[PDB]
Amino acid sequence: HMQLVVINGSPRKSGRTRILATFIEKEFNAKIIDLSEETLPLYNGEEYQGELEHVRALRDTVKKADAVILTSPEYHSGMSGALKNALDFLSNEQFAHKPVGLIAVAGGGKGGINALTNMRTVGRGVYANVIPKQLVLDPHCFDRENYTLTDDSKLLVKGVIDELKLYYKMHQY
């Protein structure tokens, strides 16, 4: 019932975040926005960008979503430049009161919380309802050799989606 969109915030074609975003796509029947495809240009605020097929598709896909998972790697203690660039095309027109769940992909140690805070702050900036439950996945959460999440990491991801579904239900109610 919930029309879920997942944004892959990593621009790296061979990166870890893409494993997570494609897991959500396949396992939860989510529409992926895969920033590793580089079909969205740098935002420059010019009118012609609003006519580009991929800018219109980004805006339409996020507006129509019942809920969004924003995934990002932590790059230098923030979300990716790629993800922020995509969000610069969007606004409260597509996000107002939309349930949003955040998942960051980190390099281990204490990485990921700075990206999650950046994402929560920007999320509130477009007036999304960023849910309480959030998640950081470290490299041990990934089997890169088989392009998958570990069983434990699939369960942690499901926990975010389950809460996001409860927030979707409340927004419908």
Give the residue numbers of the binding site for FMN. 10, 12, 16-17, 74-77, 105, 107
- Does 118 help bind a second copy (rule: CB under 8 A)? yes
Q: How many of the chain's residues bind a second copy (CB under 8 A)? A: 37
In angstroms, give the least distance from the CB of 96 to a second copy: 12
Quote the CA–CA distance of 95 and 117 in Å, as a whole number. Answer: 18
Which of 7, 86, 105, 141 forms a contact with ligand FMN (CB under 6 A)? Answer: 105
Reduced DSSP (H G I as helix, E B as strand, rest coil) percent helix, strand, coil of the chain, to 5? 45, 20, 30
Name the packing angle between helices 81-88 and 113-125 (round to 10°): 0
Radius of gyration (C-alpha) of the chain in whole angstroms: 15
- Does 99 help bind ligand FMN (rule: CB under 6 A)? no
Whether the CB-CB separation of 16 and 71 falls below 8 Å is answered with: no
Which of 29, 77, 92, 150 forms a contact with ligand FMN (CB under 6 A)? Answer: 77
- Partners of 32 in the beta sheet? 6
Which of 50, 56, 60, 77 forms a contact with a second copy (CB under 8 A)? Answer: 77
Q: Coil, strand or helix: which one is 44?
A: coil
Residues forming contacts to a second copy in the complex (CB under 8 A) are 11-15, 36, 38, 41-46, 75-88, 90-91, 114, 117-118, 121-122, 124-126
